């Protein structure tokens, strides 16, 4: 059971919900309801329609904390050396000096 999304507005289309439009070129357009569906038939441009995701994404509306930082990093430092070349005499010769 996949939830789909509205290819005009961007709303989740839970199952059996809204309509599905197979355009002449076989591009497919899932609507959640007759609103998106008519705007869409009306050659309306989702980027100019305030309540749409596509609008909001492009107008930077209330994203706020996604542009807020995070903490996802690591810390390793494990010697393996070089196969066939004694990974033994490769840390004792690795004593350095500076």
């Amino acid at each position: 059971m996949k939830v789909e999304i509205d290819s005009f507005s961007g709303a989740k289309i839970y199952p059996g919900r809204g309509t599905l439009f197979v355009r002449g070129d076989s591009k497919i357009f899932r609507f959640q309801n007759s609103k998106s569906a008519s705007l869409f038939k009306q050659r309306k441009n989702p980027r100019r329609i305030a309540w749409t995701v596509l609008f909001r994404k492009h107008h930077k509306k209330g994203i706020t904390e996604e542009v807020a930082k995070k903490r996802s990093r690591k810390t390793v430092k494990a010697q393996r050396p070089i196969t066939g070349a004694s990974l033994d005499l490769i840390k004792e010769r690795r004593s350095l000096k500076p």
């Binding site: 059971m1 709303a11 989740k12 959640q32």
Partner: protein, 48 residues
């Protein structure tokens, strides 16, 4: 209680739901739960 024991196949089938719709019936509902709606919408002028 049915007045006969149907064999049918159609009866006998042992269903088990995967998902029960729960979005509003008072409109073109988009959200199962307030939690879902809150998730997807972001934060509103009311709220916290």
């Amino acid at each position: 209680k049915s007045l006969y024991t149907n064999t049918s196949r159609k009866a006998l089938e042992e269903v088990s739901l995967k998902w029960i719709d729960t979005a509003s019936k008072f409109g073109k509902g988009r959200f199962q739960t307030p939690a879902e709606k809150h998730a997807f919408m972001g934060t509103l002028k009311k709220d916290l």
